[PDB]
């Protein structure tokens, strides 16, 4: 996934976790090159 705000909102960063979250994932992180990466 991204990290990315180019969809508008999510410019919290942290967004990218919940882009996790919402898929029952444990939540996720932002590497440096704004790829967002699930935890299980």
């Known amino acids: ?3 990315d705000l180019l969809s508008g909102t999510g ?3 942290s967004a990218c976790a ?3 979250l919402l898929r029952g994932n444990r939540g996720g ?3 440096g ?3 967002c990466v ?3």
């Open 11 to 13: 410019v919290k960063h």
């Open 33 to 35: 090159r704004a790829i």
């Open 18 to 20: 919940a882009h996790c």
């Open 38 to 40: 699930c935890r299980n």
């Open 29 to 31: 992180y932002c590497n």
């Open 1 to 3: 996934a991204t990290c």
